[PDB]
């Protein structure tokens, strides 16, 4: 026979192993394949679709009210309207999005993100806003004069209802980590803030409070690594009917 010897690792069951194994039903002929719409081959395809950010995650906002940010006609100038924590590992507005949910099944990420906002006020409502992305290092800006120094886009409401703010991949290291320490140098992405560039201006018969819906998605320069179990689901008991499957 062939002289052999067993190596360490012999007999183990590694859940991520990749080997062939005995077919339970020999000569089984699987059902012929049929074309089906919407085939997905890489999860990166899914995270490139923009989904709604829960920006209004505040007490008093219930259900869908949490998915839109209301802006009103201002009495003062250069007013701060809202900011968005760029936390993906820690809970925040970006967590329950396609990019957020899928990324959380991984530990490392790299690539540009894009935030698109759709103005949902009336046709007669006008306005200009400034959306800013502030690379990490300091405290979140609270004045337009400061936020304006970072990456930004000045948005004019009009026929084209939506604007896109690109959050370019600006990192020292190739990848960032979904680390539990939000202030870690290998995790903090910076901030996104929104201020009035001019003001929301509407006529008497148009509503004076209008909503914005913010979306986010990854660009095709995105990449995820180190698969892990997602912190978004768990169980402490048997689900109803689980035990009955044995009866």
């Amino acid at each position: 026979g062939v002289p052999t010897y067993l190596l360490p690792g012999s007999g183990q069951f590694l859940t991520t192993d990749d080997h062939s194994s005995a077919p339970v039903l020999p000569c089984f002929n699987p059902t012929p394949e049929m074309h089906i719409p919407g085939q997905i081959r890489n999860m990166l395809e899914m995270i490139q679709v923009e989904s709604m950010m829960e920006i209004n995650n505040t007490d008093g906002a219930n259900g869908m009210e949490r998915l839109r940010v209301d802006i009103s006609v201002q009495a003062d100038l250069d007013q701060l309207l809202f900011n968005i924590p760029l936390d993906i590992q820690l809970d925040g507005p970006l967590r329950n999005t396609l990019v957020g949910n899928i990324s959380r099944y991984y530990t490392h990420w790299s690539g540009s993100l894009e935030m698109t906002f759709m103005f949902c006020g009336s046709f007669m409502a006008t306005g200009k806003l400034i959306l800013c992305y502030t690379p990490p290092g300091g405290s979140c800006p609270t004045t337009r004069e400061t936020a304006m120094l970072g990456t930004h886009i000045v948005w004019d409401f009009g026929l084209q209802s939506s604007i896109t703010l690109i959050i370019p991949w600006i990192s020292g290291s190739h990848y960032r980590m979904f680390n539990s320490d939000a202030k870690s140098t290998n995790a903090n992405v910076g901030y996104v803030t929104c201020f009035m560039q001019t003001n929301l201006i509407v006529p008497s018969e148009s509503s004076d409070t209008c909503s914005l819906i913010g979306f986010i998605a990854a660009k095709d320069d995105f990449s995820l690594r180190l698969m892990r179990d997602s912190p978004d689901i768990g169980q402490s008991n048997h689900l109803h009917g689980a035990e009955a499957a044995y009866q």
Binding site: S20, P23, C27, F28, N42, Q48, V49, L159, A217
Partner: protein, 39 residues
């Protein structure tokens, strides 16, 4: 190399790098040009 007679017994197939994100990201009948106004 699969030594079993049934092909479904083989190890995983991790070589399909084909993608088409547009079926999810741009399912619009009329292609949207780069900087041209979408509407």
């Amino acid at each position: 190399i699969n030594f079993y007679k049934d092909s479904y017994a083989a190890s995983a197939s991790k070589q399909d790098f084909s993608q088409d994100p547009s079926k999810f990201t741009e399912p619009v009948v009329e292609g949207l040009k780069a900087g041209a106004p979408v509407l």
